[PDB]
């Protein structure tokens, strides 16, 4: 019969779905890691900013 | 035979299409993982400098507190 052909069709379709979702688990793991490393990097960038602000101020406080 | 050649055209078409998609996916995962490694470096150093500045200012605050 050829309905074996329709079965192999609609089976391996939904089986390729397997590695599509596995790749999505991996790539979206990485994408969230990256997003959060960016949030944190941004925190540090502005914290360095504020810290150096107040450091230069204290220095011009000692001499002046 | 034209029937056989037909079957083979479709086989080595689907297969070369898969070989294109495989590379387009793996280079993508690779880029992402290199960016994760790059940010986990640009953070070790950024936190080095940040905590260094923290120590420097908690020292300078004490210098001022001592001369009043
Ligand atoms: C996910 C999928 O259908 C697919 C296609 C072609 C491949 O061979 C290079 C491979 C997969 O999944 C694993 C893999 O080796
Ligand atoms: Cl996607
Ligand atoms: Cl997503
Ligand atoms: Cl096909």
Swiss-Prot record, chain A:
Domain bZIP: 2-64
Post-translational modification remark: Phosphorylated.
Top-rank taxon, per record: Eukaryota
Annotated region (Basic motif), positions in chain: 4-29
Annotated region (Leucine-zipper), positions in chain: 30-58
Subcellular location: Nucleus
UniProt similarity note: Belongs to the bZIP family. Fos subfamily.
UniProt comment concerning the protein's domains: Binds DNA via bZIP domain; DNA-binding is under control of cellular redox homeostasis (in vitro). To enable DNA binding, the bZIP domain must undergo a conformational rearrangement which requires the reduction of the interchain disulfide bond between FosB and JunD (in vitro). The bZIP domain is able to form homomeric oligomers via formation of interchain disulfide bonds under non-reducing conditions (in vitro). Under reducing conditions, the disulfide-bonded homomeric species dissociates into monomers (in vitro).
Reported function: Heterodimerizes with proteins of the JUN family to form an AP-1 transcription factor complex, thereby enhancing their DNA binding activity to gene promoters containing an AP-1 consensus sequence 5'-TGA[GC]TCA-3' and enhancing their transcriptional activity. As part of the AP-1 complex, facilitates enhancer selection together with cell-type-specific transcription factors by collaboratively binding to nucleosomal enhancers and recruiting the SWI/SNF (BAF) chromatin remodeling complex to establish accessible chromatin.
Self-association and partners: Heterodimer; binds to DNA as heterodimer. Component of an AP-1 transcription factor complex; composed of FOS-JUN heterodimers. As part of the AP-1 transcription factor complex, forms heterodimers with JUN, JUNB or JUND, thereby binding to the AP-1 consensus sequence and stimulating transcription. Interacts with the BAF multiprotein chromatin-remodeling complex subunits SMARCB1 and SMARCD1. Interacts with ARID1A and JUN.
Protein name from the UniProt record: Protein FosB
Originating organism: Homo sapiens
Residues of the full protein shown: 154 to 217 of 338
Swiss-Prot record, chain B:
Leucine-zipper: annotated segments: 32-60
Signal sequence, renumbered to the chain: none
Top-level lineage group: Eukaryota
Chain positions covered by the region annotation Basic motif: 4-31
Post-translational modification remark: Phosphorylated by MAP kinases MAPK8 and MAPK10; phosphorylation is inhibited in the presence of MEN1.
Residue ranges of every copy of the bZIP domain listed in the record: 4-67
Location(s), subcellular: Nucleus
Domain remark text: Binds DNA via bZIP domain; DNA-binding is under control of cellular redox homeostasis (in vitro). To enable DNA binding, the bZIP domain must undergo a conformational rearrangement which requires the reduction of the interchain disulfide bond between FosB and JunD (in vitro).
The protein's assembly and partners: Heterodimer; binds DNA as a heterodimer. Component of an AP-1 transcription factor complex composed of JUN-FOS heterodimers. As part of the AP-1 transcription factor complex, forms heterodimers with FOS proteins, thereby binding to the AP-1 consensus sequence and stimulating transcription. Forms heterodimers with FOSB; thereby binding to the AP-1 consensus sequence. Interacts (via MBM motif) with MEN1; this interaction represses transcriptional activation. Interacts with MAPK10; this interaction is inhibited in the presence of MEN1.
Similarity comment: family membership: Belongs to the bZIP family. Jun subfamily.
Free-text function comment from the UniProt entry: Transcription factor binding AP-1 sites. Heterodimerizes with proteins of the FOS family to form an AP-1 transcription factor complex, thereby enhancing their DNA binding activity to an AP-1 consensus sequence 3'-TGA[GC]TCA-5' and enhancing their transcriptional activity.
Protein name: Transcription factor JunD
Organism taxonomic ancestry: Eukaryota, Metazoa, Chordata, Craniata, Vertebrata
């Amino acid at each position: 019969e050829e309905e074996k052909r329709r079965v192999r069709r609609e089976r391996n379709k939904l089986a390729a779905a397997k590695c599509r979702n596995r790749r999505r688990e991996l790539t979206d793991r990485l994408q969230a890691e990256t997003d959060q490393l960016e949030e944190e990097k941004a925190e540090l960038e502005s914290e360095i900013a504020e810290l150096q602000k107040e450091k230069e101020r204290l220095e011009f406080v000692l001499v002046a | 035979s034209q029937e056989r050649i037909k079957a083979e055209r479709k086989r080595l078409r689907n297969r070369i299409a898969a070989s294109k998609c495989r590379k387009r996916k793996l280079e993508r995962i690779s880029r992402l993982e290199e960016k994760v490694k790059t940010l986990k470096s640009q953070n070790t150093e950024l936190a080095s400098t940040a905590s260094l500045l923290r120590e420097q200012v908690a020292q300078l605050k004490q210098k001022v507190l001592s001369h009043v």
